[PDB]
């Protein structure tokens, strides 16, 4: 019908490391799209709420946490 003849920062988020699938286990098995962002999760309100309310006290020893289990034996070491 009507064939008549005449006559956005794509490479930037990969470069920065974002929009890449990742997950934090201790937080609601939550998903994170960047490694910088997840590295920012280590200092956060909710992340520290999960730690401290979990019985694992806050700040800088537990930063590298992912799963809930290992930091429990780490806190027993504390």
């Amino acid at each position: 019908e009507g064939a008549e003849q005449v006559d956005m920062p794509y490479w930037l988020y990969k470069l920065h490391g974002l929009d890449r699938e990742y997950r934090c286990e201790i937080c609601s098995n939550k998903v994170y799209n960047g490694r910088r962002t997840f590295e920012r999760h280590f200092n956060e309100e909710r992340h520290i709420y999960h730690l401290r309310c979990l019985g694992i006290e806050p700040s800088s020893v537990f930063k590298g946490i992912t799963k809930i289990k290992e930091a429990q034996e780490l806190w027993k070491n504390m």
């Binding site: 800088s60 020893v61 930063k63 590298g64 946490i65 992912t66 799963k67 290992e70 930091a71 034996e73 780490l74 070491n77």
Partner: peptide, 21 residues
Amino acid sequence: KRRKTEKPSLSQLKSQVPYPQ
């Protein structure tokens, strides 16, 4: 491959450390 997947968890590594942070 196997050596890359053989790695212990960083938290498993923390216990060996006197200054884990």
